[PDB]
Amino acid sequence: TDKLTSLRQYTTVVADTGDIAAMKLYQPQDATTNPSLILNAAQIPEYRKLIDDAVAWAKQQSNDRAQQIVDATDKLAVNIGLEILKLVPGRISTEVDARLSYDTEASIAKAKRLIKLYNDAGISNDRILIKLASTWQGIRAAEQLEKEGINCNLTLLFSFAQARACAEAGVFLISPYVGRILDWYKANTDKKEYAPAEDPGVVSVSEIYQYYKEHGYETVVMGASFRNIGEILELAGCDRLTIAPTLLKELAESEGAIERKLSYTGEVKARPARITESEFLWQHNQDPMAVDKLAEGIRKFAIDQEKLEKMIGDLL
Amino acid sequence: TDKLTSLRQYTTVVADTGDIAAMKLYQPQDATTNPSLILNAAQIPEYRKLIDDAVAWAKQQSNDRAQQIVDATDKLAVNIGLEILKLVPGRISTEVDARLSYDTEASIAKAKRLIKLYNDAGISNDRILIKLASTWQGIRAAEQLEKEGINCNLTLLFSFAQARACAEAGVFLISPYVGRILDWYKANTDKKEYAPAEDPGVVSVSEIYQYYKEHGYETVVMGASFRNIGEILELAGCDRLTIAPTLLKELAESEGAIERKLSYTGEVKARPARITESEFLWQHNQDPMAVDKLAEGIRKFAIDQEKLEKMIGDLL
Ligand SMILES: *[C@@H]1[C@@H](O)[C@H]([C@H](O)COP(=O)(O)O)O[C@H]1O
Ligand SMILES: *[C@@H]1[C@@H](O)[C@H]([C@H](O)COP(=O)(O)O)O[C@H]1O
């Protein structure tokens, strides 16, 4: 058989898309969305119903334009999640407004709001991951949310400091990036070609996986952001991998068996003291890639939130 | 006469160097040092005495190598400052260990330590600025230090969020950058030639000046980091400008009178509520230049601190 089937021996495959067609085709365990994917899925003609339903629902919650905008955008994201959950047996990841990324209290509130919308639609918390940026503030939000029974997907994870802080916070899942790290290295160094094992994103996630397993952390490691199938294959054995339909298709069309790459077979090591905020900030900012890309990914998801709001505002 | 004399009609000229020769030649009101300048000034043959004196003093404070390293490096910076104060009637800026930049409590302690060294040498606080990075943690450190009669120079100021937070903290002085902003724009955009008025660093400091004066803030605005004399001339009227000997020389050798560029002639405007940490983080991270350059400048100054420590460690 094919490399997607072979990968699935080792790794739980997750579909990184808001498109239900992919869920039907690849029958993934979980799915991930993000504000950009929500904005793109809103353009799928067959999703016009979901948009109109979100708007109609919002208009019934209040007579305030600003609030209708927020209600409609949140309901759209949730409506898309609900369609996906009809077709995937595991989790949907739904991302909070990235404008809240440096605000712990606002992020906790938004997570609870999205959870409420799902719960009111009949979906329990065991089917949802609230996805948010792994800034210090986001990690602290997640720590509290997990204590209150809300499982999170900590994302935009670039530096080891972020990885460590997320594990120490006991978050349900992390989605550390591969592809965006490659992007940075291609843009900021003269090496524009990497063998899969030397891809800096592959190295990053591999190192994270090892750290997590060597210290007995239970946080799920889900690689995210991919540019090529080689990156994915180098991470075979990662707990989960979230992969866009384009690369799911490439894997399914690639013949051959693959070997497991990521394993931990040793003893559990004693954990350090928790990283402090000051230590986290020092260490994250040692990493010029992580500095740039965390801030950038937040800015970009925030822009897409604003674009979604503009789309919705025009329909009220 | 010359452009340096002409500039001095409008702006207090400060010498950006650890080299006493410059203080004698240009007779500046104040001087600024930084960890890189301290490392460089340590290489001036005539400063060997200052180094040997710092090491000998350190060895008398303790028999602990780690502590001697810190004591000697701090004493060297102060010894250089003391030499400069013999030749300048105003302030010396002496910068704290940049490794402390994301640690408010450690930064407060270091500032007080340096102040103690100066005070023990007979120098009062009205002659000293403790220089530190304008991270949130540094601004909070400075806010407290000012309440305790220690005047600070908040530096590595790139974003407007930083400028606003520094003003709101009531810091004695800021040293926002011009030249490093130009550096970033040349490296990250296709425009590698700027007319002085369009130089993004000039624009940054000009905007900061306007904001400070329009809201009645008393914090001194001292432009820092220069790549050419045109940048400096565009800021004629800035409260202070700290300028390296190379450009002081260029200004002194340029004939011609210059006009004042930076002025505020209006009414005092009401201040907003204080920017919160979350707002500050959001706004700072909107600025990819500021994101990169704040973290980078900290990393670089920290490296120079380590290099200084290596030099000292070798002499114990
Ligand atoms: C959410 C998930 O949807 C995304 C995605 O995997 C990133 O992919 P690129 O945009 O291709 O880098 O990342 C998580 O934050
Ligand atoms: C301290 C001061 O010494 C420096 C200096 O002005 C920066 O100049 P470049 O190194 O040429 O950009 O800046 C303050 O932090």
PDB file of N, CA and C and ligand atoms in Angstrom, chain A residues 15-17 32-37 93 95 131-132 153-157 175 177-181 183 222-227 242-244 300-301, ligand 1:
ATOM      1  N   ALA A  15      -6.684  15.874  10.074  1.00  0.00           N
ATOM      2  CA  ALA A  15      -6.839  16.671   8.848  1.00  0.00           C
ATOM      3  C   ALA A  15      -6.860  18.158   9.196  1.00  0.00           C
ATOM      4  N   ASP A  16      -6.014  18.915   8.510  1.00  0.00           N
ATOM      5  CA  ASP A  16      -5.832  20.343   8.775  1.00  0.00           C
ATOM      6  C   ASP A  16      -6.580  21.137   7.716  1.00  0.00           C
ATOM      7  N   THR A  17      -7.881  21.304   7.943  1.00  0.00           N
ATOM      8  CA  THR A  17      -8.769  21.915   6.980  1.00  0.00           C
ATOM      9  C   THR A  17     -10.164  22.041   7.594  1.00  0.00           C
ATOM     10  N   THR A  32      -8.229  19.841  12.553  1.00  0.00           N
ATOM     11  CA  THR A  32      -7.858  21.178  13.044  1.00  0.00           C
ATOM     12  C   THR A  32      -8.357  22.244  12.082  1.00  0.00           C
ATOM     13  N   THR A  33      -8.827  23.348  12.668  1.00  0.00           N
ATOM     14  CA  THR A  33      -9.070  24.570  11.946  1.00  0.00           C
ATOM     15  C   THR A  33      -8.225  25.701  12.563  1.00  0.00           C
ATOM     16  N   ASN A  34      -8.262  26.849  11.898  1.00  0.00           N
ATOM     17  CA  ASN A  34      -7.616  28.054  12.379  1.00  0.00           C
ATOM     18  C   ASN A  34      -8.340  29.216  11.696  1.00  0.00           C
ATOM     19  N   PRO A  35      -8.065  30.448  12.134  1.00  0.00           N
ATOM     20  CA  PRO A  35      -8.828  31.579  11.605  1.00  0.00           C
ATOM     21  C   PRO A  35      -8.701  31.743  10.086  1.00  0.00           C
ATOM     22  N   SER A  36      -7.520  31.470   9.546  1.00  0.00           N
ATOM     23  CA  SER A  36      -7.307  31.501   8.098  1.00  0.00           C
ATOM     24  C   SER A  36      -8.123  30.448   7.399  1.00  0.00           C
ATOM     25  N   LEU A  37      -8.126  29.230   7.947  1.00  0.00           N
ATOM     26  CA  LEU A  37      -8.925  28.145   7.360  1.00  0.00           C
ATOM     27  C   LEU A  37     -10.401  28.424   7.457  1.00  0.00           C
ATOM     28  N   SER A  93     -10.314  21.068  16.657  1.00  0.00           N
ATOM     29  CA  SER A  93      -9.643  22.250  17.187  1.00  0.00           C
ATOM     30  C   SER A  93     -10.236  23.511  16.572  1.00  0.00           C
ATOM     31  N   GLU A  95      -9.891  27.707  17.045  1.00  0.00           N
ATOM     32  CA  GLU A  95      -8.965  28.695  17.533  1.00  0.00           C
ATOM     33  C   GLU A  95      -9.637  29.990  18.002  1.00  0.00           C
ATOM     34  N   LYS A 131      -7.944  26.122  20.652  1.00  0.00           N
ATOM     35  CA  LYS A 131      -6.612  26.317  20.092  1.00  0.00           C
ATOM     36  C   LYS A 131      -6.217  27.764  20.341  1.00  0.00           C
ATOM     37  N   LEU A 132      -5.002  27.963  20.807  1.00  0.00           N
ATOM     38  CA  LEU A 132      -4.552  29.321  21.129  1.00  0.00           C
ATOM     39  C   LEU A 132      -3.038  29.383  21.080  1.00  0.00           C
ATOM     40  N   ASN A 153      -5.300  23.161  22.709  1.00  0.00           N
ATOM     41  CA  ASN A 153      -4.301  22.907  21.688  1.00  0.00           C
ATOM     42  C   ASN A 153      -3.420  24.162  21.658  1.00  0.00           C
ATOM     43  N   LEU A 154      -2.248  24.058  22.261  1.00  0.00           N
ATOM     44  CA  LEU A 154      -1.310  25.191  22.306  1.00  0.00           C
ATOM     45  C   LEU A 154      -0.499  25.158  21.033  1.00  0.00           C
ATOM     46  N   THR A 155      -0.574  26.248  20.289  1.00  0.00           N
ATOM     47  CA  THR A 155      -0.016  26.291  18.969  1.00  0.00           C
ATOM     48  C   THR A 155       0.968  27.464  18.816  1.00  0.00           C
ATOM     49  N   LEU A 156       1.489  27.625  17.613  1.00  0.00           N
ATOM     50  CA  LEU A 156       2.491  28.684  17.329  1.00  0.00           C
ATOM     51  C   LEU A 156       3.679  28.505  18.259  1.00  0.00           C
ATOM     52  N   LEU A 157       4.074  27.257  18.365  1.00  0.00           N
ATOM     53  CA  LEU A 157       5.121  26.821  19.237  1.00  0.00           C
ATOM     54  C   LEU A 157       6.407  26.623  18.412  1.00  0.00           C
ATOM     55  N   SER A 175       0.670  21.821  19.307  1.00  0.00           N
ATOM     56  CA  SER A 175       0.856  21.694  17.875  1.00  0.00           C
ATOM     57  C   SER A 175       2.067  22.510  17.424  1.00  0.00           C
ATOM     58  N   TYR A 177       5.258  23.710  15.294  1.00  0.00           N
ATOM     59  CA  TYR A 177       5.390  23.856  13.860  1.00  0.00           C
ATOM     60  C   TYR A 177       6.658  23.275  13.287  1.00  0.00           C
ATOM     61  N   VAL A 178       6.518  22.802  12.058  1.00  0.00           N
ATOM     62  CA  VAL A 178       7.629  22.364  11.251  1.00  0.00           C
ATOM     63  C   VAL A 178       7.866  23.350  10.101  1.00  0.00           C
ATOM     64  N   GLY A 179       6.853  23.501   9.260  1.00  0.00           N
ATOM     65  CA  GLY A 179       6.965  24.216   7.997  1.00  0.00           C
ATOM     66  C   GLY A 179       7.367  25.662   8.164  1.00  0.00           C
ATOM     67  N   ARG A 180       6.757  26.350   9.114  1.00  0.00           N
ATOM     68  CA  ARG A 180       7.078  27.784   9.276  1.00  0.00           C
ATOM     69  C   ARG A 180       8.500  27.992   9.721  1.00  0.00           C
ATOM     70  N   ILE A 181       9.068  27.007  10.403  1.00  0.00           N
ATOM     71  CA  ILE A 181      10.483  27.069  10.792  1.00  0.00           C
ATOM     72  C   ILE A 181      11.346  26.955   9.548  1.00  0.00           C
ATOM     73  N   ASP A 183      10.397  27.789   6.614  1.00  0.00           N
ATOM     74  CA  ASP A 183      10.183  29.058   5.920  1.00  0.00           C
ATOM     75  C   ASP A 183      11.195  30.112   6.403  1.00  0.00           C
ATOM     76  N   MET A 222       1.486  17.007  18.620  1.00  0.00           N
ATOM     77  CA  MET A 222       0.903  16.978  17.293  1.00  0.00           C
ATOM     78  C   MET A 222       1.658  17.927  16.373  1.00  0.00           C
ATOM     79  N   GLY A 223       2.553  17.386  15.561  1.00  0.00           N
ATOM     80  CA  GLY A 223       3.226  18.215  14.549  1.00  0.00           C
ATOM     81  C   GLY A 223       2.199  18.881  13.624  1.00  0.00           C
ATOM     82  N   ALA A 224       2.475  20.132  13.276  1.00  0.00           N
ATOM     83  CA  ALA A 224       1.632  20.948  12.403  1.00  0.00           C
ATOM     84  C   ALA A 224       2.527  21.768  11.495  1.00  0.00           C
ATOM     85  N   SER A 225       1.937  22.271  10.405  1.00  0.00           N
ATOM     86  CA  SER A 225       2.607  23.116   9.412  1.00  0.00           C
ATOM     87  C   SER A 225       3.583  22.306   8.593  1.00  0.00           C
ATOM     88  N   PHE A 226       3.199  21.986   7.359  1.00  0.00           N
ATOM     89  CA  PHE A 226       4.067  21.190   6.525  1.00  0.00           C
ATOM     90  C   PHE A 226       4.226  21.780   5.137  1.00  0.00           C
ATOM     91  N   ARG A 227       5.417  21.625   4.609  1.00  0.00           N
ATOM     92  CA  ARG A 227       5.743  22.110   3.292  1.00  0.00           C
ATOM     93  C   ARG A 227       5.971  21.001   2.288  1.00  0.00           C
ATOM     94  N   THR A 242      -1.077  16.803  12.091  1.00  0.00           N
ATOM     95  CA  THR A 242      -2.148  17.458  11.380  1.00  0.00           C
ATOM     96  C   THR A 242      -1.618  17.935  10.049  1.00  0.00           C
ATOM     97  N   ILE A 243      -2.300  17.499   9.004  1.00  0.00           N
ATOM     98  CA  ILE A 243      -1.779  17.564   7.649  1.00  0.00           C
ATOM     99  C   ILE A 243      -2.875  18.087   6.738  1.00  0.00           C
ATOM    100  N   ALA A 244      -2.496  19.003   5.847  1.00  0.00           N
ATOM    101  CA  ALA A 244      -3.444  19.600   4.913  1.00  0.00           C
ATOM    102  C   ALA A 244      -3.804  18.578   3.833  1.00  0.00           C
ATOM    103  N   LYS A 300      -0.925  37.491  11.716  1.00  0.00           N
ATOM    104  CA  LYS A 300      -1.608  36.968  10.542  1.00  0.00           C
ATOM    105  C   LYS A 300      -2.984  36.372  10.853  1.00  0.00           C
ATOM    106  N   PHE A 301      -3.068  35.573  11.898  1.00  0.00           N
ATOM    107  CA  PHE A 301      -4.361  35.048  12.346  1.00  0.00           C
ATOM    108  C   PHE A 301      -5.319  36.166  12.789  1.00  0.00           C
TER     109      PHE A 301
HETATM  110  C1  LIG C   1      -3.434  25.446  13.393  1.00  0.00           C
HETATM  111  C2  LIG C   1      -3.322  24.688  12.102  1.00  0.00           C
HETATM  112  O1  LIG C   1      -4.520  24.835  11.361  1.00  0.00           O
HETATM  113  C3  LIG C   1      -2.151  25.474  11.528  1.00  0.00           C
HETATM  114  C4  LIG C   1      -1.420  24.956  10.315  1.00  0.00           C
HETATM  115  O2  LIG C   1      -1.003  23.635  10.543  1.00  0.00           O
HETATM  116  C5  LIG C   1      -0.213  25.826   9.993  1.00  0.00           C
HETATM  117  O3  LIG C   1       0.150  25.578   8.634  1.00  0.00           O
HETATM  118  P1  LIG C   1       0.905  26.652   7.726  1.00  0.00           P
HETATM  119  O4  LIG C   1      -0.036  27.810   7.615  1.00  0.00           O
HETATM  120  O5  LIG C   1       0.952  25.909   6.387  1.00  0.00           O
HETATM  121  O6  LIG C   1       2.254  26.961   8.317  1.00  0.00           O
HETATM  122  O7  LIG C   1      -1.243  25.644  12.601  1.00  0.00           O
HETATM  123  C6  LIG C   1      -1.985  25.602  13.818  1.00  0.00           C
HETATM  124  O8  LIG C   1      -1.708  26.826  14.466  1.00  0.00           O
END
